[PDB]
Design a protein around this nucleic acid. Structure first.
Length: 114
RNA sequence: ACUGAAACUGUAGUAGAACCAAUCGGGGUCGUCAAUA
């Protein structure tokens, strides 16, 4: 298997309700019908997790060696941004939202003739 | 065919009240490139 695949981003014209485009609930108050609060999550690794600290990357002959990123207690500092981006991309998939990061992609790509 | 004199433009008054330097973003990952014989 190729180590990547894709999740189809179905078009979303005519999608309605909470999966549609909607005005945001907002932050001004806790809405009577809408949930707020704390979710506690356990994350456990199944395969090893790379958390490279690019601030401490060391280079020889243009090759970069990364240590693990560690916190003020010397345990691995898994960034919440890295969790959030995993979670968001997973969320965007199963919810089929707009794709949050689409770069320009506005030039025609190129290929070579046989 | 005799200059008026003398008299503080001063006294009171907080450039201040309200306002989040903030919103979004996995330190990530695969096949291209060259054109002829």
């Amino acid at each position: 298997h190729n180590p990547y695949n894709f999740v189809p981003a179905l078009p979303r014209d005519g999608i309605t309700g909470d999966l549609g485009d909607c005005a945001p609930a907002g932050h001004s108050y806790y809405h009577g019908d809408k949930y707020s609060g704390r979710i506690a999550v356990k994350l456990t690794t199944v395969t090893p997790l790379l958390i490279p600290d690019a601030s401490k990357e060391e280079i020889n002959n243009n090759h970069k060696t990364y240590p693990v990123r560690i916190g003020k207690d010397g345990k691995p500092y898994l960034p919440p941004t890295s969790i959030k981006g995993m979670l968001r991309s997973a969320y965007e998939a199963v919810t089929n939202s707009r794709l949050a990061v689409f770069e320009d992609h506005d030039s025609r790509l190129a290929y070579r003739m046989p």
